[PDB]
Amino acid sequence: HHSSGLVPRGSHMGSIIDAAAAAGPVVLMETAFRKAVESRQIPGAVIMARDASGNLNYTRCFGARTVRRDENNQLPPLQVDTPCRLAAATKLLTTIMVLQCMERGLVDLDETVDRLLPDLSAMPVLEGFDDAGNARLRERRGKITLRHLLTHTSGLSYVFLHPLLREYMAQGYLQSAEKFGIQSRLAPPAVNDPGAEWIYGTNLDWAGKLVERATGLDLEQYLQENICAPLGITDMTFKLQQRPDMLARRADQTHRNSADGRLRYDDSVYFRADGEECFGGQGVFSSPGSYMKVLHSLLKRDGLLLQPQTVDLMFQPALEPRLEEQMNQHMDASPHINYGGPMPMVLRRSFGLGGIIALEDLDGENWRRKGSLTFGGGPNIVWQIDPKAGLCTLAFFQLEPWNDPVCRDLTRTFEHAIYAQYQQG
């Protein structure tokens, strides 16, 4: 029997083991993250999950925001409020800003870009190269609309992804299209006509210019007034170099070397210069906490950023059958790029406004459902919103290259565990 005036706890090996039940999925998953930090496989990570109701409000932070030791010879922690490089996780923010312009009657999604982006309309299509080493350029067929930009179906690509453009750079055509070591996302030509194929490209850099020109505000000021202010966010900016308080606390980028799998400090150009202009495809710095506030508002359909019916538009498959099948073919054949991060490498998908849409359940009732929206950012950041499950999640790393196996595996383990314990319906 228990001791007088003391709580009856476990008094021997039998009842102490039985004092608490076995470890559930989330506890086991946290141990995997702690082991990855301890064994030096990752620098650190922040993982977050929320439902609409508020009953799920889960945030865990592991490890360091850098591999560089501080003034006290320590590795400072990656925190929920640590300023991080979002890279392509910026695209969701820019998509929201575009849709607000639509709501306010400043733009129409199906109007051609010619009016606000005559500099894009005038850009030719790079068809190939001549034998002497000269670009063969031609006129675009059909018009680019704002909806082509939001769905990556405009004909635009990225220089570091398409072979025609990689050659274009090698020939010296983009020597003068860069400042502070940051290359312009507006200078390079298109590689196809609009509507022809899904191609990942500088579409949101152009869409951000459209927002600036539609509103008469620079994207930074538009961001502050229309996304940050309504959510009470004070640390989300294109202009990190103008915020000494964020600079003093920011993450460093870490890179994993292909040869020995070791983590090294990545002296990224993006952390020493903001660049002259706001690039809505890649340019925002923020904390995981503030990014989750964006995801959560969208999940809740609380009208703080967009009207609920406009948010619903983001989750609708935007691609006609021909493009849907071409995008899926491309993505299935490109696991070395892997736009979908932790998702199964073969999956029926479409593209919405702001990310990839799952057209089927990822694993029946165990994980993300049909209708879920997702994308990511370079440093292994992955976000998703799942209206059917009533969940949104984010996994924030500051580690390149994209599609790192350790990060992807941990991210999958995180989501699986959260869905197993907390998914509803």
Ligand X SMILES: CCC(C)(C)C(=O)O[C@H]1C[C@@H](C)C=C2C=C[C@H](C)[C@H](CC[C@@H](O)C[C@@H](O)CC(=O)O)[C@H]21
- Contact 423/391 with Cβ under 8 angstroms? yes
Token pair recorded at residue 225: 């007034």
Task: Please tell me the chain's helix, strand, coil percentages from 3-state DSSP, rounded to the nearest 5.
Answer: 35, 15, 50
Taking CB under 6 A as the rule, does residue 208 contact ligand X? no
Question: Per CB under 6 A, does 204 bind ligand X?
Answer: no
- By CB under 6 A, which span of 35-43, 46-54, 68-76, 394-402 interacts with ligand X? 394-402
By the 8 A CB rule, do 368 and 49 touch?
no
250-to-132, 203, 281, 297 alpha-carbon distances in Å: 48, 28, 21, 25
Residue 62 touching ligand X (CB under 6 A)? no
**Residue from 168, 206, 291, 339 that binds ligand X (CB under 6 A)?**
339
- To ligand X, the closest distance from the beta carbon of 403 in angstroms equals 7
Q: Please tell me whether residue 376 binds ligand X under the rule CB under 6 A.
A: yes
* Beta strands per DSSP E along 73-165: 84-85, 125-129, 135-138
List the 356-358 sheet strands across, edge first: 57-63, 44-51, 391-396, 381-386, 373-377, 356-358, 349-351
Beta strands 349-351 and 285-286 are unpaired
CA distances 413 to 68, 108, 179, 392, 408, Å, are 28, 41, 41, 15, 9
By beta carbon distance, the residue nearest ligand X is 88
Taking CB under 6 A as the rule, which mask of x and - marks residues 7-46 in contact with ligand X?
Answer: ----------------------------------------
- The token pair at 249 is 């606390």
Is 45 within 8 Å of 62 (Cβ atoms)? Answer: yes
Residue number with CB closer to ligand X (26 or 353): 353
Indicate the residue among 92 and 246 with the shorter CB distance to ligand X: 92
DSSP code of 228? I
How many residues contact ligand X, by CB under 6 A? 17
Check binding of 315 to ligand X (CB under 6 A).
no
CA distance 318 to 351: 6
**The one among 43, 275, 371, 378 contacting ligand X by CB under 6 A:** 378
What residues form DSSP beta bridges with 63?
A: 44
User: Is 375 a residue that touches ligand X (CB under 6 A)?
Assistant: yes
Contact pick of 51, 274, 324, 400 for ligand X (by CB under 6 A): 400
Nearer to ligand X, 26 or 91 (CB): 91
Among 160, 248, 259, 309, binds ligand X (CB under 6 A): 160
Token representation of residue 354: 């702001």
Q: Is 87 in the site for ligand X (CB under 6 A)?
A: yes
Closer to ligand X by Cβ: residue 56 or 343: 343
Per-residue x/- mask for ligand X, residues 250 to 289, rule CB under 6 A?
Answer: -------------------------------xx-------
| Residue 377 binds ligand X, judged by CB under 6 A | yes
Part in contact with ligand X (CB under 6 A); list of ranges 73-81, 136-144, 213-221, 399-407: 399-407
Residue type, 161: L
User: Does 328 engage in binding with ligand X (CB under 6 A)?
Assistant: no
Contact 92, 297 (CB under 8 A): no
What are the residues binding ligand X (CB under 6 A)?
87-88, 158, 160-161, 200, 281-282, 337, 339, 375-378, 400-402
